[PDB]
Amino acid sequence: SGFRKMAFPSGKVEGCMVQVTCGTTTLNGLWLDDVVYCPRHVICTSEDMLNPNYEDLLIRKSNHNFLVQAGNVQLRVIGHSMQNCVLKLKVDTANPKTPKYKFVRIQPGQTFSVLACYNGSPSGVYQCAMRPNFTIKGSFLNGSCGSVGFNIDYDCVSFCYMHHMELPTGVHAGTDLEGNFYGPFVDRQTAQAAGTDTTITVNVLAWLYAAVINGDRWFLNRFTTTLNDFNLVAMKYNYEPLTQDHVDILGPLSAQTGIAVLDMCASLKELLQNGMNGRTILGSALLEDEFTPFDVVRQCSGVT
Amino acid sequence: SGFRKMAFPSGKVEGCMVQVTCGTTTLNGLWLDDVVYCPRHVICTSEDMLNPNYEDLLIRKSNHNFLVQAGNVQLRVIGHSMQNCVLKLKVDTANPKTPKYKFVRIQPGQTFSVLACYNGSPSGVYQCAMRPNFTIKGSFLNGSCGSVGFNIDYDCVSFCYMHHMELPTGVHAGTDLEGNFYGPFVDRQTAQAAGTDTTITVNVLAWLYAAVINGDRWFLNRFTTTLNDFNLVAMKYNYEPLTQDHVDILGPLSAQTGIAVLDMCASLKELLQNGMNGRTILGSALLEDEFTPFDVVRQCSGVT
Ligand SMILES: O=C(c1ccc2c(c1)OCO2)N1CCCCCC1
Ligand SMILES: O=C(c1ccc2c(c1)OCO2)N1CCCCCC1
CA-closest residue to ligand 1 atom 6: A279
CB proximity B172 to A under 8 Å: yes
Q: Which of B88, B49, B97, B50 is nearest to B68 (CA)?
A: B88
Cβ(B242)–Cβ(B227) under 8 Å? yes
CB proximity A275 to B under 8 Å: yes
Does the annotation mark B41 as catalytic? yes
Ligand 1 contacts CB of residue A279 (under 6 A): yes
Closest in B138, B143, B275 to A302, CB measured? B143
Resolution (A): 1.6
Give the number of other CB atoms < 10 A from CB of residue B64.
8
Cβ(A154)–Cβ(A144) under 8 Å? no
- Chosen CATH of A15-99 out of 2.40.100.10, 1.20.120.80, 3.40.50.620, 2.40.10.10: 2.40.10.10
Q: Report how far apart, in Å, the C-alpha atoms of B127 and of each of A5, A6, B12, B137, B186 are.
A: 8, 8, 16, 10, 24
Angle CA(B268)–CA(B269)–CA(B270) in degrees, nearest 5? 90
Q: Quick one: which ligand is closest to A270's CA?
A: 1
Q: How was this structure determined?
A: X-ray
Distance, in Å, from the CA atom of B23 to the CA atom of B39, rounded to the nearest integer, reads: 14
Determine the distance separating the centroid of ligand 1 and the alpha carbon of A280, expressed in angstroms: 10
Q: Cβ < 6 Å from ligand 2: which residues?
A: B 277-279
Closest in B122, B172, B299 to A304, CB measured? B122
Cβ-Cβ contacts under 8 Å between A and B: the total is 156
Q: Which of B226, B8, B231, B228 is nearest to B112 (CA)?
A: B8
Would you tell me which residues 18-37 of chain B have a C-beta closer than 8 angstroms to some C-beta of chain A?
Answer: none
Tell which phi-psi region holds residue B2, choosing left (phi > 0), alpha (psi between -120 and 50) or beta.
left
Testing ligand 2's pocket by substitution, the residue of B273, B279, B281 carrying the most ligand atoms inside 8 A of its CB is B279
Chain B residues lying within 8 Å of A284, measured CB to CB: 285-286
> What letter represents residue B2's amino acid?
G
Cβ(A48)–Cβ(A57) under 8 Å? yes
In chain B, where the domains are located: 1-14+100-197, 15-99, 198-301
Determine the distance separating the centroid of ligand 2 and the alpha carbon of B276, expressed in angstroms: 8
Ligand 1 contacts CB of residue A280 (under 6 A): no
Does the annotation mark B172 as catalytic? no
**Residue ranges in chain B assigned as alpha helix (H):** 11-14, 54-59, 201-213, 227-236, 244-249, 251-257, 261-274, 293-301
Side-chain half-sphere CA neighbours of A223 within 13 A:
13
> What letter represents residue B152's amino acid?
I
Cβ(A101)–Cβ(A159) under 8 Å? yes
- Which residues, 6+ apart, have CB-to-CB distance to B142 below 8 Å? A302
CB proximity B70 to A under 8 Å: no
CA-closest residue to ligand 2 atom 1: B277
Distance, in Å, from the CA atom of B116 to the CA atom of A84, rounded to the nearest integer, reads: 38
Fold agreement between B15-99 and B198-301: no
User: How far off is chain B from A64, nearest CA to CA, in Å?
Assistant: 27
Ligand 1 contacts CB of residue A62 (under 6 A): no
Catalytic residue among B22, B38, B41, B246: B41
User: How far off is chain B from A93, nearest CA to CA, in Å?
Assistant: 22
Determine the distance separating the centroid of ligand 2 and the alpha carbon of B270, expressed in angstroms: 14
Nearest C-alpha in B relative to A277: B278
- Which residues, 6+ apart, have CB-to-CB distance to B162 below 8 Å? B30, B37, B38, B39, B86, B146, B147, B148, B149, B174, B175, B176, B177, B179
CATH topology of domain A198-301: main proteinase (3clpro) structure, domain 3 (1.10.1840)
CB proximity A46 to B under 8 Å: no
Q: Do A9 and B276 touch (CB under 8 A)?
A: no
Distance, in Å, from the CA atom of B193 to the CA atom of A94, rounded to the nearest integer, reads: 54
Distance, in Å, from the CA atom of A240 to the CA atom of A295, rounded to the nearest integer, reads: 19
Testing ligand 1's pocket by substitution, the residue of A277, A280, A281 carrying the most ligand atoms inside 8 A of its CB is A277
Q: Quick one: which ligand is closest to B271's CA?
A: 2
The DSSP symbol for B226 reads -
Distance, in Å, from the CA atom of B81 to the CA atom of B61, rounded to the nearest integer, reads: 11
Between strands A100-103 and A156-166, the pairing is parallel
Chain B residues lying within 8 Å of A128, measured CB to CB: 4
Q: Do A125 and B10 touch (CB under 8 A)?
A: yes
CB proximity A99 to B under 8 Å: no
Nearest C-alpha in B relative to A124: B8
Cβ(A103)–Cβ(A57) under 8 Å? no
Distance, in Å, from the CA atom of B203 to the CA atom of B221, rounded to the nearest integer, reads: 19
Q: Do A128 and B4 touch (CB under 8 A)?
A: yes
- Which residues, 6+ apart, have CB-to-CB distance to A137 below 8 Å? A128, A131, A171, A172, B2, B4, B283
CATH topology of domain B1-14+100-197: Thrombin, subunit H (2.40.10)
Tell which phi-psi region holds residue A78, choosing left (phi > 0), alpha (psi between -120 and 50) or beta.
alpha
Cβ(B144)–Cβ(B117) under 8 Å? yes
Distance, in Å, from the CA atom of B134 to the CA atom of B195, rounded to the nearest integer, reads: 9
Q: Which of B133, B115, B117 is nearest to B125 (CA)?
A: B115
Q: Which of A7, A5, A294 is nearest to A147 (CA)?
A: A7
Displacement of CA B221 from its chain's centroid (Å): 33
Q: Do B125 and A10 touch (CB under 8 A)?
A: yes
The DSSP symbol for B270 reads H
